[PDB]
Subunit: 437 residues, 3 copies
């Protein structure tokens, strides 16, 4: 097992690039319900009475409308952060990085990346759900909105303001900018920079010198390409990968099913049918039975609305988090641990998903650690010398200085150290020569 | 359109300082409702019966009380982060920066900044709203609280614990500290520092050397002053700028209006008036009709309470975000992209607003980009040299090194580069002389 | 009072390490309620009727189940971030830091730290609460779940998936890793490093050179040890320190008490007892009275469920914040102001608490500030020199350069300054000699 030591340090001699996907729901289907059609359907005697209950219907209808509008804002706040659409890079001559699975391709009319085309297939809408049956009733015609609503007990699904194609186009712009302009494309003009240099400068942000990339550019490129390939298989095989997006769809479907099914409930009355009770009873007695169904059908709808408001808040938080991660992880480089995947964040790539966003985080994780003896300071000519950058390490009989995240032994010289103190205060100082550079 | 290139880099030759306002709601009006006065008003027969319904009234009353207390905490958590009130700086001899529109002035008794005096005028309370009518009924007297509540169907608005003047005083302290003590005033004692130096050190935090400020101090000062002037006009002209704060006020007003209006509803009864039904009917029949209004007037109030709880959660999240932004953007310098406005964050200034906070974010955005040929490394004497800071750029026949966010060509010397490798591994290395400093 | 000055700077000559605790609720008791036992208990006539009300019971039961599952996820997302359990460090020979109050000890079978053993005692469950009475009814037996539920009006508390011991074991692993492997244990392999070096490198992250730790290691160690001792007394004495955790427990207890007490309510009927009304009335009249209690007992339970959903969202946000702070504050070093305690964040230590987490944040706050005259640049041989790091300060007749967060006057030399401009542009430049290093 791991054991502490007062004079031993472990420094990584190698590295492995990894890509970790994170899926967050961003929006919900713009479902809506009419309160004067769910309770009373075609009946004129049930409406007159429902007016005496005041604003109850108007309150629930307005609440659902707010949720629908919130879904449009949620999507805009995430994907619309950049609207200076960057043109796709036609030069397929990067330094080995094969974005072919990340960027779109022309071999299909959907203009979606191979990963996006898989995500859009893993999430599906069942034929038993009213969300699909309502669409078949319209047939893209808008005039039959009220006709289909009357058939589906007043259920109405509004069309999203931004189509799936618009979201894909916005995501492509973010990708092209990051690949061609780095993190600065989101903080100003399209300051183009070569991608190998961009990675070299991102390495310096995680304490790794630019040298490591250039001397390992082919190896680093191969690692990135393999990681992007493996994630596609992982999502394809694992059926419960996009559960976060499927769960929100399933939850909304169950809510509508329970709401519509409750119309078949008597709530303590002679029947669930308003024409049957109104024909069996006389007027001075039917209104007692037609008041029990109205009150049961109002609490049912109120339960649906209140549950949707709670669910909408969860999606709103996820959408805000997604927008924050797009800015920090995609448009920049987040130093915050675990915010842009495991390991040190280098860069991330966004991918569109149905009612959600998938972030591909590229991170640097050290590997192949090796033990080395270390000392806090070096003593020379009575002066105590400290490392300006990196750590002092001992290769048996010799002492060297090296980067903390990559083993690179260098001779201890005045150019990489600084001096302070009379060598009598630093506990554990070791005597070693410092050469003049 | 923008095009990628493997050997071209764009570096900005100039900069434009910009100020972007962000408005967040922090609190809500401390509205409260009594459940034994909304349903039954002055009637003793309606109360006896309302007791049989158990704790329903106590649950709703306690819920509203919690919301009111939460509003006080929300404001305290945002503005009370610093309470060592810093004295206003009477020396109007900064390095050109004209905070006169940001700081208070003595020409008015409100002691609010010119921007604050505009924000407090763009948000207004209508005379038709009960929030104002309740205040006119009290006339600052506290003894008539119960008398005015009985008139307004039990509606009662509690006074905020912190007055608008207290919030302004707290904001002034934060401003004076930031202007006179920088980001350290919030992490320890009032370590005073000259403002030009403070900006010079904030520039170094965004990759821009201190030199750029000193050689452009007058230009930078003029840019800041113009930006602070333009924002005042923007808020004055644009009527939908403070909508986030007006929307929460409007939403609460509509909720009370719908609640009070529902008292005029029969909920399926002989009349909405309890004395009328109780006088027309005998006792063994009036209780059937006085049970239908109690149940309608309880779900109405329950709908108001539940909707307020959902709205209070949204304000709580905004208040927490505002407190986080005050610490990160005002008391410090946030590296997180888009968290403290567009562009690289330099500093921000807080301004008080009715039930909200307005953050003025000052950011650095590069401008006037110019294309330059770049190489990843320099080859000299067979050794490959890499840039210690900045990027190598070619001015036609000559190669230079320059900062990434400001064009400053310097001769390539050992003092600004480091060496590694035998010049046979770096792809794209170029041969150029490195001079001895 | 503090006063601004254009040529004076304050630099701290000393420092005081401080430890500030932050308590956040992470989970809630897995309470659950059966909807066909709260309303109708043992009665077969009340169930037949309750079926006509449709899915109402199934909706409320499913909602409570989701909350219970959410509590398990909340705890896992916070504590399970690391599962490579690090072995306790048996070498009690650190550089003076006495973690004995932070780490567990073997003198007790609970295997909890002295601070953890106090936190687990300050929060208690009253004997009048059903949460305890339900446990006494089971006696650790699982077969009597349904029997005890029938006695407690259908109330059922589920056992947590992770026991208190498992949470303590996970917290110990995080502590051992941080003490023996620093922030890298959470971003890769267990890269061991000596603790004094780890603190020396964390100091460099707050602008303080490693020198300050080594020359003050004994003083810094003593300060840390004293701070850890004082916090234990603070929590022991202050009774309202863990209120955030006690409040959530109290709120849930009151909710169940109000729910169960409402069974004693007539809701406008002949009695709250179903056998009494069903025996006094004939069948064609008892169903009118047995429909009024069902509807009152359904809105009561619905009010409990909706309030719990609102409360569960608050805990979910706190749990997410706790997980974020564990990653940023414990597994790393957060530059974000006020996110990991007052002052500059050095490191933090986690401690388990009942249904919550306590973070011990160790921060650096400067002290003993001293005024010094400063200049933005130095003029020599007509060239304007700027400080590469730190600030220029004047000790009366002599000019020196020093770190911004620690007074360390050094001679101005080319090794600690850089040159730019012709000395005619920098406003406030002072003439002083720069020596050749
Ligand atoms: C580092 O790891 C990679 C894994 O792809 C391996 O190919 C390589 O040989 C290892 N060593 C070095 C020095 O790169
Ligand atoms: C990128 O990967 C795909 C995988 O199918 C491959 O077809 C393509 O040739 C690769 N690109 C290059 C330049 O080899
Ligand atoms: C490093 O240690 C090995 C093992 O003792 C030795 O063979 C080698 O020469 C050492 N390195 C140098 C530069 O002497
Ligand atoms: C940079 O932009 C400012 C805009 O105010 C302009 O005055 C100035 O001439 C431009 N060029 C330089 C070198 O500052
Ligand atoms: C600051 O701006 C205001 C704008 O009205 C102006 O009156 C004032 O003179 C300015 N300050 C200075 C020092 O010029
Ligand atoms: C930079 O390029 C221009 C255009 O060729 C040239 O006139 C100028 O002399 C170059 N700079 C230097 C320092 O030679
Ligand atoms: C700094 O503060 C500590 C407080 O513990 C004190 O012991 C010490 O004498 C002070 N001065 C120095 C130079 O450390
Ligand atoms: C650590 O503190 C405890 C406090 O009771 C003390 O008993 C123990 O001796 C201390 N450790 C050392 C090494 O002195
Ligand atoms: C610093 O100032 C004091 C007071 O004038 C003086 O005694 C001392 O000699 C100065 N330091 C140096 C290095 O001259």
């Amino acid at each position: 097992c791991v054991a502490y030591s007062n004079n031993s340090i472990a420094i990584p001699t190698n590295f492995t690039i990894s890509v970790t996907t994170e899926i967050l729901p961003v929006s919900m289907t713009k479902t809506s319900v009419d309160c004067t059609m769910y309770i009373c359907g075609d009946s004129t005697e049930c409406s007159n009475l429902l007016l005496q209950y005041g604003s109850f219907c108007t309150q629930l209808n307005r609440a659902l409308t707010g949720i629908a509008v919130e879904q449009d804002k949620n999507t805009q706040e995430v994907f619309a952060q950049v609207k200076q659409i960057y043109c796709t890079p036609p030069i397929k001559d990067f330094g080995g990085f094969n974005f072919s699975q990340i960027l779109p391709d022309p071999s299909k009319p959907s203009k979606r990346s191979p990963i996006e085309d898989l995500l859009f297939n893993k999430v599906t809408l069942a034929d038993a759900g009213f969300i699909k049956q309502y669409g078949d009733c319209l047939g893209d015609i808008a005039a039959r909105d009220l006709i289909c609503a009357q058939k589906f007990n007043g259920l109405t699904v509004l069309p999203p303001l931004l189509t799936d194609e618009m979201i894909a186009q916005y995501t492509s712009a973010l990708l092209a900018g990051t690949i061609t302009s780095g993190w600065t494309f989101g903080a100003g003009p399209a300051l183009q920079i070569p991608f190998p240099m961009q990675m070299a400068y991102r390495f310096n942000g995680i304490g790794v010198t630019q040298n490591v990339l250039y001397e390992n550019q082919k190896l680093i490129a191969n690692q990135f390409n393999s990681a992007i390939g493996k994630i596609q298989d992982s999502l394809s095989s694992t059926p419960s990968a996009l559960g976060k997006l499927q769960d929100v769809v399933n939850q909304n479907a169950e809510a509508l099913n329970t709401l519509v099914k409750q119309l078949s409930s008597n709530f303590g009355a002679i029947s669930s049918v308003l024409n049957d009770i109104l024909s069996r009873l006389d007027p001075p007695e039917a209104e007692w039975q037609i008041d029990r169904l109205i009150w049961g059908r109002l609490q049912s709808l109120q339960t649906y609305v209140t549950q949707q408001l709670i669910r909408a808040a969860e999606i709103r938080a996820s959408a805000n988090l997604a927008a924050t991660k797009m800015s920090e992880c995609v448009l920049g480089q987040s130093k915050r641990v675990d915010f842009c995947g495991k390991g040190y964040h280098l860069m991330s790539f966004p991918q569109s998903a149905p009612h959600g966003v998938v972030f591909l985080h590229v991170t640097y994780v050290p590997a192949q650690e090796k033990n080395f003896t270390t000392a806090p300071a070096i003593c020379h000519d009575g002066k105590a010398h400290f490392p300006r950058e990196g750590v002092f390490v001992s290769n048996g009989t010799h002492w060297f200085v090296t980067q903390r995240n990559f083993y690179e032994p260098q001779i201890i010289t005045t150019d990489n150290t600084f001096v302070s103190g009379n060598c009598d205060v630093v506990i554990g100082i070791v005597n070693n020569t410092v050469y003049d550079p």
